[model samples]
Target: SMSVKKPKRDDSKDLALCSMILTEMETHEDAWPFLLPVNLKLVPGYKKVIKKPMDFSTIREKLSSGQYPNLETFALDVRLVFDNCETFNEDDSDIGRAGHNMRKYFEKKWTDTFK
Candidate 1:
């Protein structure tokens, strides 16, 4: 069987919160662009402009790796996902607009679950 091994500082509450929220995001209508890391071949310029690319997949794996020490850090990475998209995607563009909308979705859900 697979196992999760991380030092102390693990909190199941944060893990559960992040995990639940991520699946919600992944299911959202605008989640297509954010489901995975930006493809280098598809958008070569994405790497140049965005400082740090974040995605639901990255966040998902982070939780699995036990990388988050607190809820705030977990939320931080989540925002970075949308935040980076805003920089690369045009405001009126189709998938580009999903970043903004999804951020709103995440914001509301964050308040509901995290606070």
Candidate 2:
């Protein structure tokens, strides 16, 4: 339901947002609070897709304490998000599918490296 057009790779703001997300995810003990507010404000009608409010405390507790040995867990988390969003789309569009594929690719590499 977002009105903004999907950003292309060349968009500076998109790149900046991604960088901010990456940094916050890497550094913050509780990133969901920061991310949720900002993203909700920026994306119009975002609440339609994000029906349930983000439980920042829970996300914080999980990320701050939970152990993820490698990127496979991260990829799986992303895959869950993709699966949730894909269900919202009426058309069989390729939204986030490329990223899903790339995540799977890296997940395979991560497992192979560990093995």
Candidate 3:
């Protein structure tokens, strides 16, 4: 049987790679919707629907604080952003489309580096 390859331990190398992908994801055109926490002033209903809000900026803070003990933990938050969006927005809507593109971009980089 073949086992899937995983990211290396959360050493300096792993942290560096994870951070690299985060930065790349941050710069993506579709990343605008996910760059920061949803504005409470604009989307007041957002909190009522989305139980767990995640964003690239939050992930960066988590990374800076050493919260991601493993690469998988880092990835978990990255995926959470898209999942939350899929729940709050429709597949073909502007926000939904952006989330999909951002997720697609991240998964591509993820596979290239650590799959």
Candidate 4:
């Protein structure tokens, strides 16, 4: 007889942390006006799939749904959302710096959680 191994259980703690972070990102004062409506027209072929502005709520919903098979995929999605933000004037925007900081924080915490 051969033995089989079961998959590890999902980490609820990490998921909760991710949810909390996303909630914050979605609710940030400048998030709606500054980050929403990320134009996917910048990417070829994305115009058809993304007809409207991308909002934090959509990302939050996906993260909260717990549908990703692994944390890596979830993290990737989070990164993509932040990475699409419009270019900010390094000298003039506090919100731009804040958004960068948020993404950095998420990467560090996410890596620590899984490591």
Candidate 5:
């Protein structure tokens, strides 16, 4: 994903023009750049989470107060769509339960024999 060569344009005008061109093409459905396999841009308002770890309480209060109307609903709706069902089911099942027991047994045996 890294660019090999150094950039050619160093001028502000060239940079601005390049940015504008990219923005225009990105907005257009037909000319959208499909260079990568997936879109890397974060959804608006979701930037803060990735940029830095935020206080959950402050986020919760903002969500409750409707400061970001779309964000509050988007957060709730997206969770249902992308929920980790396997992890949830794993907690309730006996399947692979022996893995934990095996780990404990190995740790106990190793420490007793070596330590």
Candidate 6:
């Protein structure tokens, strides 16, 4: 018999993370730069269709709209935001370190919240 790995479920942690990120960005202008890469990475076809600044409201709407089936998918999107950006290497600079911290927060909180 073959074994199938089920995806992690989203019990509002994903939405909470998105909200937290947005709130942080709103309070700290410096965090906005880090968030742009994340939004671009998460939104499909956004690179081509987006003309001006990407709005947090728009991203939040998509995230909360059930577009993502599971927490794993949402986590991948979050990772991509930092992974694709050269500035956010997760180990070197301040932004990178901060991004890593945020990722870690999500990981820890997701596990605690779900399990």
Ranking by lDDT: 3, 1, 4, 6, 2, 5
Instruction: Score every model by TM-score.
Output: 0.85, 0.33, 0.87, 0.54, 0.22, 0.48
Model 4: per-residue lDDT, tens digit, 1-115?
A: 2587687676767777777766666665656533454456665654564433344666666666867666666777766655544332242467566667667766776766566
Task: Write candidate 2's Cα lDDT for 1-115 as tens digits.
Answer: 5788866544334333333434444354422222333256776666777664332233344444644334444445534443544444333445335334434544454454343
Q: Give the TM-score of candidate 4.
A: 0.54
Identify the runs in model 2 with alpha carbons over 4 angstroms from their true place.
1-38, 51-61, 67-76, 84-98, 113-115
What is the TM-score of candidate 1? Answer: 0.85
- CA lDDT, every prediction? 0.85, 0.42, 0.91, 0.60, 0.33, 0.54
Model 4 poorest ten-residue lDDT run? 83-92
Distance (Å) between predicted and true CA of 78, model 6?
1.7
**Candidate 2 vs 5: which has more lDDT:** 2
**Candidate 3: what lDDT?**
0.91
Model 6 alpha-carbon drift over 4 Å, by segment: 1-31, 37-59, 86-90
Q: What lDDT score goes with residue 38 in model 3?
A: 93
Estimate, for each residue in 1-115, the C-alpha lDDT of model 5 and write its tens digit: 3768776643434333333433432343432112121222644433432333222233334444545444224233223211222222243444224323333443454344334
Flag regions of model 3 displaced more than 4 Å.
Answer: 1-11
Clashes of each: 0, 0, 0, 0, 0, 0
Report residue 56 deviation for candidate 1 (angstroms). 0.8
Clash pairs for candidate 4: none
For candidate 3, list the clashing residue pairs, or say none. Answer: none
RMSD values for the candidates in order, in angstroms, are: 7.3, 17.0, 4.4, 5.5, 21.4, 7.4
lDDT of 1 by residue, 30-97 (tens): 79988889887788798788888888988899888978888899889998988888788789999778
Model 2: how far residue 42 lies from native, Å = 1.9
Q: Could you tell me the TM-score of candidate 6?
A: 0.48
